[PDB]
Amino acid sequence: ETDQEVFLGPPEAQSFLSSHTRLTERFWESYIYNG
C-alpha cells in the first residue's frame, strides 16, 4: 500500500495531543454499520 500509508514521519507519529476540528464510548457489542 505504497510508502505513504505504511510509514509516518517522526513529527507526525509523536503528536500525542490531537484536538477537535481535526462519543469515544466504544461498546464492542455493536455491529458496525456498513453497506
Binding site: 500500500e1 510508502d3 500509508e5 505504511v6 510509514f7 509516518l8 514521519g9 517522526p10 513529527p11 507519529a13 509523536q14 503528536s15 500525542f16 495531543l17 490531537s18 484536538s19 477537535h20 476540528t21 469515544t24 464510548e25 466504544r26 461498546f27 464492542w28 457489542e29 455493536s30 455491529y31 454499520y33 456498513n34 453497506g35
Partner: protein, 665 residues
C-alpha cells in the same frame, strides 16, 4: 397434589434415582411452542445473514491479492477464496431457510451450524454475545424435534405430523435463557455499574423523556438505567418460570427489549429474545390461539445436564485460560458482560527498528488491519506483530523489531499504557495457559480521582481541552506539540516528574501543583522519577481555530451589517462572493471566504435534514435495505456462475460488477 409439584411441575421422588430422572426428562409434550420458536428464529437468521454477518460487504473483506492481518482463534485456520466464501454463505442461507420452513430439519440445522461456527472462529474481532447465542441456539435446535408441528415435513411425512417431544427440549432452552439473564445480572454486579459510571450518557435520549417528569437526569441515569437493568435481569430470569408472575415478567421483558432495540444497534438480539420469551408458557399455547428406558432417553438427560453445567462454568473459566486475561477477563463474546466497560483510546505509536542497518521508523497505527480490537488483547497484538514481521520485508525492511505504545482508559479513568513499550513483541513470549509478562497492571488504586477530575472538566472554558495521564516509574513519554496548539500547559497532580525541552536540552523537576508552559512546535519529554506512579495533565487550546472562528464571526457580523441596511460605503471585492454565492467570472476567493461558504452550506444542510418528515425517513430506510439485499443476491449469483460455468472476460465481469452496485431507484 403437592404444592411443590404444582409450582415446580415435578415431584421430589422423581429425583430419587437415575431411572426416575430419565423418565421425568422424557415425558411427552406438545410441540407447538417449539415450532413457533423455530419459525421465528429461522426467519430472524434469514434476515440477519445479509446484514450483520457481512454478505453484502464480503467482496471488500476477503478480496484476493490484498495482504491483510487476520485474527483467528487458531493460526491454522485460513480463509478460502472469495467464490468459496460465497458458496459457504449460500449453504448457510439454505440451512436457515430449511430451519424456518422445517424442510429436512436435521440437514438444514447441520448446514447452518457448521459454516456459522467456521465464520465465527475465523475472526475474533467480530465476536459478541448475540452471535454466541445464535450458535448455541442452533446447536441446541439441531437435536430437538422442532418439525412435528406446522412444518412442510409434516405435510410430506405422516410419521412426523403432530407427535410428542421430550421435556428436556424445553428444559434446555429455558435453562439457556435463564443462564443468559442471570449471568448478565451477576456480571453487572460490578463497581462501575452499581455506581452509574458505565453507560452514564444514556439518560439524554428522548425515550427516557417521561422519567424526567418526576426525576432529575442523574437520578434517572442511576435508578432507572443502571439498577433497573440488573433488577430486570434477575427478575426476568426468575418470574417467567412461575405461573403467578409470568404476565408481569412478559410485560417488563417486552418493554426492556423494545427499548434496547431502539436505543442500540445490536441487531436482531432483541427480537430473538422477544421470540424466546413465550417459551416459558404452556407447551400448547399456540394451539388455543388457532382455536426400562432405552439409550436415547438416557443420552438426552446426560446432554441436558452436561450442557447446562458447561454453560454455567464457561463464563467463570478465566483462571484456566490466563493468556487471554487483560484489564478485563478473557476474550469478549461468551461472558454475558454486555455494556459494562467503555474504552477511549488516546494515542497508538508503532515503532520499528531494522535489524541490518539499525534505522528507527514509525508505522501507521492501523495498517494492514480491518478492525481496531488489537489494541486491548495480547494475543491479537502478537498476531499483528507476526503479520507485520512477515509483511515488512516487501517494503525494503530487514528482520524488524516492533515496539507498541498504546494509551487507553476504562470508564473515565487516567490514560495509562496497557503494554510495556520496551518489549519486542515479535520475539516476546506468549502462551494461552500462562500469564503475559508484558501487560501493565491497571492503576486501580486511583479509583476515587474520577470524582475530582470531573470538577476540572467543569472548570474549563468553551475551547480548552484537558487530557489526564498516569505513568509508571522508569518510563518516559516523548511528545511533539503541533504548531497550531499554542498555549499548552502541563500541571502535575501527584508524584514527581521531570520535563525536558530538547531544543536547549533543559529539564526541570516538577512537584505537586507546579505548572509549566510548553513550547509549540518542538519536542518535549516527560520522565517519571518517583517510586510510585505519577499523575499529571495536559491543558491545551487550539490557537489557529480560535483565530479563524473570530475572523469568521467578524465577517458574519459585517455581512449582517450590510444586510440590515448599515455600512452604506462600497463593499470590498472579497465581500462580493458572499452576496453572490457563486464564483463565476471573477478571481478565486480567499480560503476564509471558502470556509465561510462551506460552513453556511453545512448549516443549511443540517437544518434541511432536521426539517424532514417521518415517512420520508421510513421510505429511505426501506430503500437502503432493499439495495443491500439486491447487492447480496447479485454478487452471490455472479460468484456461483464463476464457480460453475467458469469466469468470463474482464469486460463482462466489470459490467456485472457495475450492475450489481447500482442503486435501486
Amino acid at each position: 397434589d403437592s404444592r411443590i409439584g404444582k409450582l415446580l411441575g415435578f415431584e421430589w421422588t422423581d429425583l430419587s434415582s437415575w431411572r426416575r430422572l430419565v423418565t421425568l426428562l422424557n415425558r411427552p409434550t406438545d410441540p407447538a411452542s417449539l415450532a413457533v420458536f423455530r419459525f421465528l428464529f429461522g426467519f430472524l437468521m434469514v434476515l440477519d445473514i445479509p446484514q450483520e454477518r457481512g454478505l453484502s460487504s464480503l467482496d471488500r473483506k476477503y478480496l484476493d491479492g490484498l495482504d491483510v492481518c487476520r485474527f483467528p482463534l487458531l493460526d491454522a485456520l485460513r480463509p478460502l477464496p472469495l467464490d468459496w466464501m460465497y458458496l459457504v454463505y449460500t449453504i448457510m442461507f439454505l440451512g436457515a431457510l430449511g430451519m424456518m420452513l422445517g424442510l429436512c430439519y436435521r440437514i438444514s440445522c447441520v448446514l447452518f451450524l457448521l459454516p456459522y461456527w467456521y465464520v465465527f472462529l475465523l475472526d475474533k474481532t467480530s465476536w459478541n454475545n448475540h452471535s454466541y447465542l445464535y450458535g448455541l441456539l442452533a446447536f441446541q435446535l439441531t437435536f430437538m424435534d422442532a418439525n412435528h408441528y406446522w412444518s412442510v415435513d409434516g405435510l410430506l411425512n405422516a410419521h412426523r405430523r403432530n407427535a410428542h417431544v421430550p421435556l428436556w427440549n424445553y428444559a434446555v432452552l429455558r435453562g439457556q435463557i435463564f443462564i443468559v439473564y442471570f449471568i448478565a445480572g451477576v456480571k453487572k454486579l460490578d463497581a462501575d455499574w452499581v455506581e452509574g459510571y458505565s453507560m452514564e450518557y444514556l439518560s439524554r435520549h428522548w425515550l427516557f423523556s417521561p422519567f424526567k417528569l418526576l426525576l432529575s437526569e442523574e437520578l434517572t441515569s442511576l435508578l432507572v438505567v443502571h439498577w433497573g437493568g440488573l433488577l430486570l435481569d434477575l427478575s426476568a430470569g426468575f418470574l417467567l418460570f412461575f405461573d403467578v408472575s409470568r404476565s408481569i415478567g412478559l410485560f417488563f421483558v417486552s418493554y426492556f427489549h423494545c427499548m434496547n432495540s431502539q436505543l442500540f444497534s445490536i441487531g436482531m438480539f432483541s427480537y430473538v429474545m422477544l421470540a424466546s420469551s413465550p417459551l416459558f408458557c404452556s407447551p400448547e399455547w399456540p394451539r388455543k390461539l388457532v382455536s426400562k428406558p432405552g439409550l436415547r432417553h438416557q443420552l438426552g438427560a446426560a446432554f441436558t445436564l452436561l450442557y447446562l453445567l458447561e454453560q454455567l462454568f464457561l463464563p467463570y473459566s478465566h483462571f484456566l485460560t490466563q493468556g487471554y486475561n487483560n484489564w478485563t477477563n478473557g476474550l469478549y463474546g461468551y461472558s454475558w458482560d454486555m455494556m459494562v466497560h467503555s474504552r477511549s483510546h488516546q494515542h497508538v505509536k508503532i515503532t520499528y527498528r531494522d535489524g541490518r542497518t539499525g534505522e528507527l521508523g514509525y508505522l501507521n497505527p492501523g495498517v494492514f488491519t480491518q478492525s481496531r480490537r488489537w489494541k486491548d488483547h495480547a494475543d491479537m497484538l502478537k498476531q499483528y506483530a507476526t503479520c507485520l514481521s512477515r509483511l515488512l520485508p516487501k517494503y525494503n525492511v530487514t528482520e524488524p523489531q516492533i515496539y507498541f505504545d498504546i494509551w487507553v482508559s476504562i470508564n473515565d479513568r487516567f490514560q495509562q499504557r496497557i503494554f510495556d513499550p520496551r518489549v519486542d513483541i515479535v520475539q516476546a513470549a506468549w502462551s494461552p495457559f500462562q500469564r503475559t509478562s508484558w501487560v501493565q497492571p491497571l492503576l486501580m488504586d486511583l479509583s476515587p480521582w474520577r470524582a475530582k477530575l470531573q470538577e476540572i472538566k467543569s472548570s474549563l472554558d468553551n475551547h480548552t481541552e484537558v487530557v489526564f495521564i498516569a505513568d509508571f516509574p522508569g518510563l518516559h513519554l516523548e511528545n511533539f506539540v503541533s504548531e497550531d496548539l499554542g498555549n499548552t500547559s502541563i500541571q502535575l497532580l501527584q508524584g514527581e516528574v521531570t520535563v525536558e525541552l530538547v531544543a536547549e536540552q533543559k529539564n526541570q523537576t516538577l512537584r505537586e501543583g507546579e505548572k509549566m508552559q510548553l513550547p509549540a512546535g518542538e519536542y518535549h519529554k516527560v520522565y517519571t522519577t518517583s517510586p510510585s506512579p505519577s499523575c499529571y495533565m495536559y491543558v491545551y487550546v487550539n490557537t489557529t481555530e480560535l483565530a479563524l472562528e473570530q475572523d469568521l464571526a467578524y465577517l458574519q457580523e459585517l455581512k449582517e451589517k450590510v444586510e440590515n441596511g448599515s455600512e452604506t460605503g462600497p463593499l470590498p471585492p472579497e465581500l462580493q462572493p458572499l452576496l453572490e454565492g457563486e464564483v463565476k467570472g471573477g478571481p478565486e476567493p480567499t480560503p476564509l471566504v471558502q470556509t465561510f461558504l462551506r460552513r453556511q452550506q453545512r448549516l443549511q444542510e443540517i437544518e434541511r435534514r432536521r426539517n424532514t418528515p417521518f415517512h420520508e425517513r421510513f421510505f429511505r430506510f426501506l430503500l437502503r435495505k432493499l439495495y443491500v439485499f439486491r447487492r447480496s443476491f447479485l454478487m452471490t449469483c455472479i460468484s456461483l456462475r464463476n464457480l460453475i460455468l467458469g469466469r468470463p472476460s474482464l469486460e463482462q465481469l466489470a459490467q456485472e460488477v457495475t450492475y450489481a452496485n447500482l442503486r435501486p431507484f
